[PDB]
Write a protein that binds this ligand. Structure first.
Ligand SMILES: N#CCc1ccc(Nc2nccc(Nc3cc(C4CCCC4)n[nH]3)n2)cc1
Ligand SMILES: N#CCc1ccc(Nc2nccc(Nc3cc(C4CCCC4)n[nH]3)n2)cc1
Ligand code: NA
Ligand code: NA
Ligand SMILES: [Zn+2]
Ligand SMILES: [Zn+2]
Ligand SMILES: [Zn+2]
Ligand SMILES: [Zn+2]
Lengths: 297, 297
């Protein structure tokens, strides 16, 4: 006997579905993920051990009609919603606040040696008061194939080339891509296939590092294929000239072809972008007080 | 006994594969489309009746290893190749020459009441001398579902909403999108789902026309969903301000939400964009003489 009034469908994928619902007794508004199973179980495994105030809350798990249901707290919208509803990207003060909270989340995970593996705008939830939370841990790890169209756009060059090892740096690449999109409103590496993606990476970001060039030139998927050979500015302000200067600096530090050249999440949190005008010192009390003032009501 | 030396793979889709090959006796370089069948047969049906100098030549058809093989002439590259290899889009003089020839092709088809149904950069072939040819007629008609990722980006709002009738105007919408991409280097409506696409159409182009709004608000796929409500400049130069003025004017005329408001292919060929400086009068002899000088050798 369904304990939930399904209210509407807010998502769907190769995996299944997210439904906005209302517990029949609680009256509580939830988001229920419903699959058709490794991925369900490893998401559950993760949410049992890991907790943070910029990660989404899991409430319960049931298995009605031979399917697994994951009830989460409901958060007003996503960053994808913002980019789909408003022109030209996020206002700059608001962008900074989102990014810091996104970074707090990613750093928490990276300190615990978790790779998220699916950073993108839909998986950033945004409450009405503007507290952001990270979600979707089905592919998180200490490779499971992610068949999703949007996911390709944020994939790092080592994932695209199927390098046998990869790690935390793939979350940093995806973040750098998302930052550009949140700043301009436009996805940076939109692509319709991996071959397309590889060309765009090389065209817009940089040539393959030697190891990745080696894997490319030995890969049978990509035989005959010669990549674009392109010069790029070495200066961040030049290379992303439509962005705020320090924002350009971060993006440059994220989008390095060689994963080992990418900035860590720790260092990103301490970047001049966030410390310039005492923002962290002003923001953290305002954050702690929201979560206070909201927790009471 | 394969009569062809397969040389390399230049394409692949939900349909099958394109291989660059060399006939073992002729030594002739070909592109062979290989399926796994309605779509094969309707492409063949089309290529038997229809012929033009800006459409790709079919040579023969065979059925080896329970599969259908369509041997075409081989053309150096595609417009997709150009956008994947070079920064910031096509040089303006070259863009104009491509578009005119693309339009000659589309108009030829529309005069014969054919809807192409899959205008996009990969399906524009470009020879070394820069003669362009249209290809891929599997979905051409006087709706078969097109499962391809890139295809979504060029789909008109009526296709997205599954309107029971649509026609020639969907080729004009797709062309307008492709023009923007060829001009800037960036796809205009990159999207990862139809819901995403609908938001971007409304955000960047215009609100749904009343009939399409009706279908949207009655559609079960899209229930609960409220689209972005957005004002757009009415002037073409303003609305696409990074384009050449007359090029902006064409794009505006293509990208009208109501298909019945879109410009015809006939009128596009006669636009000021092509007549301003006597270009058609200068271009057509240069075209006819290339095809002469090339036909001899
Ligand atoms: N997982 C996942 C991916 C996903 C994430 C968001 C959405 N769409 C969406 N769209 C609007 C609001 C919203 N609020 C929300 C969702 C959740 C859950 C975490 C996650 C599954 C419920 N909590 N609060 N989600 C759709 C898919
Ligand atoms: N059909 C179709 C779609 C398609 C079109 C082009 C390509 N890729 C490509 N990439 C580089 C060159 C090229 N030259 C070429 C292809 C053809 C055929 C018409 C069409 C099928 C062979 N003639 N000349 N095609 C891949 C797929
Ligand atoms: Na995911
Ligand atoms: Na096609
Ligand atoms: Zn929306
Ligand atoms: Zn390796
Ligand atoms: Zn290429
Ligand atoms: Zn209708």
């Amino acid at each position: 006997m369904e304990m939930y009034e399904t209210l509407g469908k807010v998502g769907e994928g190769s995996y299944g579905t997210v439904m906005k619902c209302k517990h029949k007794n609680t009256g509580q508004i939830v988001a229920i993920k419903i699959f058709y199973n490794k991925i369900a179980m490893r998401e559950i495994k993760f949410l049992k051990q890991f907790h943070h105030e910029n990660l989404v809350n899991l409430i319960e798990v049931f298995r009605q009609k031979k399917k697994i249901h994951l009830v989460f707290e409901f958060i007003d919208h996503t960053v994808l919603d913002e980019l789909q509803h408003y022109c030209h990207g996020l206002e700059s003060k608001r962008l900074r606040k989102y990014l810091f909270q996104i970074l707090r989340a990613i750093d928490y995970l990276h300190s615990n040696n978790i790779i998220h593996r699916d950073i993108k705008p839909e998986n950033i939830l945004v409450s009405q008061s503007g507290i952001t939370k990270l979600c979707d841990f089905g592919f998180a790890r200490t490779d499971i194939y992610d068949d999703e169209v949007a996911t390709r756009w944020y994939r790092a060059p080592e994932l695209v080339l199927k390098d046998t090892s990869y790690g935390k740096p793939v979350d940093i690449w995806a973040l750098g891509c998302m930052i550009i999109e949140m700043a301009t409103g436009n996805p940076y590496l939109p692509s319709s296939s991996d071959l397309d993606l590889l060309h765009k990476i090389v065209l817009k970001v940089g040539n393959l590092s030697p190891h990745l060039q080696n894997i490319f030139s030995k890969s049978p998927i990509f035989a005959g294929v010669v990549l674009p050979q392109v010069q790029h500015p070495k200066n961040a302000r030049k290379k992303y000239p439509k962005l705020n200067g320090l924002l350009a600096d971060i993006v440059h530090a994220c989008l390095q072809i060689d994963p080992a050249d990418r900035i860590s999440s720790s260092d990103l949190l301490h970047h001049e972008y966030f410390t310039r005008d005492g923002f962290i010192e002003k923001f953290m009390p305002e954050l702690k007080a929201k979560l206070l003032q909201e927790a009471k009501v």
